[PDB]
Structure 1
Amino acid sequence: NLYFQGMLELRLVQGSLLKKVLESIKDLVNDANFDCSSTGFSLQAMDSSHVALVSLLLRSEGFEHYRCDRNLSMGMNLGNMSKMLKCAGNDDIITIKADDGGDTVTFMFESPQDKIADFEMKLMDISEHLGIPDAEYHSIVRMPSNEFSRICKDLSSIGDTVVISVTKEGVKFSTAGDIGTANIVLRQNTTVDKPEDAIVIEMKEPVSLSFALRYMNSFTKATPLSDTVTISLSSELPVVVEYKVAEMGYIRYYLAPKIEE
């Protein structure tokens, strides 16, 4: 066949992964295209204020079955998709099915029980993607995702803006608000038996930038996907906050800084 209509069919044995992926992006991005390519099943979208960007990839080798006839895009209301995936059991096998310019997407949930559920959602017509540069960052911090999540929630109780600075002393998160000021300093620490417990700091040049904590706290919705989080900083770029998706991909969040007028 050559005049085939594009078609997508994905069978993911660990359905819980896809549920956690949607929970990681649905509050940041309302509607977006899921893109289909040889490499895998991906999404790139900004938040509605254009302050943050999410770039997501689920690689083809993580699916039990991976058909991506040509380069489909599925225009998806992420909240509606999330609502349908919330009906999958954490141990369900999940199958996504859609036609190139099709009007609906079908989700199949199969239990490993003789229970089979079919959910059918309307698609939307959605676009223009940004080019992400392959830059060299001035500093990279890797740390346990739960520790970063705790730090962001704690500081956000004190103020709205966090200064992240990397120096020879370590990584410092600072905030000031109506009730006082807070400074949290992590130094490099690899004195651990499990490397995902480490705090690793690689500084090529010192860097200090300011960011809205509200966005940082939405990023930490991806914590259940990844024992680890990597924060990449340079004074000329958004910060990058990267989570692993099991062993089959990633979610990267980019956040534009706050700067003096």
Structure 2
Amino acid sequence: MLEAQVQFASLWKRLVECINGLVNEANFDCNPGGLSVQAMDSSHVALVHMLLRDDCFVKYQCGRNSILGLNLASLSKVLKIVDSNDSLSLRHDDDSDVVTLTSENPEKTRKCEYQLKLLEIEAESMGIPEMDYRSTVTLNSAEFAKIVRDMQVFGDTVTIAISKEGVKFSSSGDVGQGYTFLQAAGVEVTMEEPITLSFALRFMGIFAKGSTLSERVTLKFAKDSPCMVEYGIDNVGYLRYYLAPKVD
């Protein structure tokens, strides 16, 4: 059986939101190292990889590796009612077809218990592309979020140009033609060459909801290669998205 208590459900609420944006069901891999969702979107273009490390939690027990299919829709619909500042313990007793969240008040005056059915989740097609990333750029997560919401009013394909002295997000639509430019303030560009990719803005949008977790996001790029955008969870996990460049 697995047991994993978070001090503040804050985290789970902020986390499941991000990943429910990409996929409506995902397998949690629970080894003793910690919890680990790694799923693809249905178009096989974007991949989430989240790791919560054991020291993320106040209580963690997972003797042997169980895999739990959860419906992230339902999980979302529940965590939406769990209070920010309540604790949330997630258990599964090994034989059962259910997982169980339990939410206590600091002052123990109120206890909530919800239980969700597990699923058989079919395809773990996967393949964490991890190549070598030449170009990097790091910025206030919420700025990144605004910039994709901004580029969205124009077209549906942000074009990111990276150069010694800053980064240029450009889009184009019927409304006209935008560009936001961030001078290398703040904004830690640190590349090897000039480098320009483009990207489905739908997905950048799903990823940018990341800003709920980390003051700062990091985008990593390489030619012909999936960008990765990584949100650091404290020093106790990562939410990490990869997305195929647009070509054709």
Pick from 116, 122, 145: which aligns with 2:117? 122
Deviation at 1:221, TM superposition (A): 1.2
In structure 2, distance between residues paired with 1:208 and 1:100? 49
Is structure 2 residue 46 aligned with structure 1 residue 52?
Answer: yes
| Equivalent of residue 176 in structure 1, options 172, 187, 191 | 172
How far apart in 2 are the matches of 1:38 and 1:208?
40
2:188 to 186, 193, 200: 200
Range that drifts further, 251-260 or 240-249: 240-249
**C-alpha offsets along residues 38-90 of structure 1, whole Å, 9 cap, x if unaligned?**
32111000112211110001110111110112111110000101111122110
Contact 2:40 2:48 survives alignment (8 Å):
yes
Q: 2:207: which partner in 1? A: 219
For 2:27, the aligned partner's letter is N
- Counterpart of 2:150 (choices 144, 154, 157) is 154
After superposition, residues 15-54 of structure 1 pair within 5 angstroms as 15-54=9-48
Q: In the alignment, which of 51, 64, 69 is matched to residue 75 of structure 1?
A: 69
Match status 1:251 vs 2:239: yes
CA distance in 2, matches of 1:169, 1:91: 42
- Determine the structure 2 residue equivalent to 1:192: none
2:97 equivalent to 1:103: yes
Task: Report if aligned partners of 1:106, 1:120 keep a CA contact under 8 Å in 2.
Answer: yes
> Per the alignment, in what secondary structure is the counterpart of residue 259 of structure 1?
coil
CA distance in 2, matches of 1:146, 1:89: 23
Shift of 1:210: 0.9
Please say if residues 73 and 100 of structure 1, whose CA atoms lie closer than 8 Å, have aligned partners that are also in contact. no
Shifted more, 15-24 versus 132-141: the winner is 132-141
Residues 32 and 63, structure 2, Cα contact 8 Å, conserved in 1: no
Where structure 2 has 5 or more consecutive residues not aligned to the other structure, the ranges are none
1:92-119 CA-partner distances (Å, limit 9, x unpaired)? 1100011345300010001103111110
Contact 1:44 1:129 in 2 (8 A): no
* SS of the residue 1:28 aligns to: coil
Partners of 1:174 and 1:72 in 2: CA distance = 44
Judge conservation of contact 1:142–1:228 (CA < 8 Å) in 2.
yes
Q: Distance in 2 between matches of 1:182 and 1:84?
A: 39
Compute the TM-score of the two structures, normalised by the length of structure 2.
0.95
Where does the alignment leave 5 or more consecutive residues of structure 1 unmatched? 1-6, 190-197
2: distance between equivalents of 1:249 and 1:235?
A: 27
- Give the equivalent residue in structure 1 for 2:197: 209
Question: Residue 86 of structure 1 aligns with which residue?
Answer: 80
What is the distance in 1 between the residues matched to 2:21 and 2:137? 25
Contact residue 51 and residue 237 of structure 2 kept, 8 A? yes
Distance in 2 between the 1:36 and 1:140 partners? 31
Tell me if structure 1 keeps the 8 A contact 2:164–2:190: no
1:162 aligned partner, one-letter code: V
Which of 138, 147, 159 in structure 2 is aligned with 1:163?
A: 159
CA RMSD, Structure 1 to Structure 2 (Å): 1.3
Q: Could you tell me whether the CA contact under 8 Å between 2:39 and 2:124 is conserved in 1? A: no
Please report the TM-score for the alignment, with normalisation by the length of structure 1.
0.90
Query: What is the count of residue pairs matched by the alignment?
Result: 246
Question: Following the alignment from structure 1 to structure 2, what is the Cα–Cα distance between the partners of residues 133 and 177?
Answer: 31
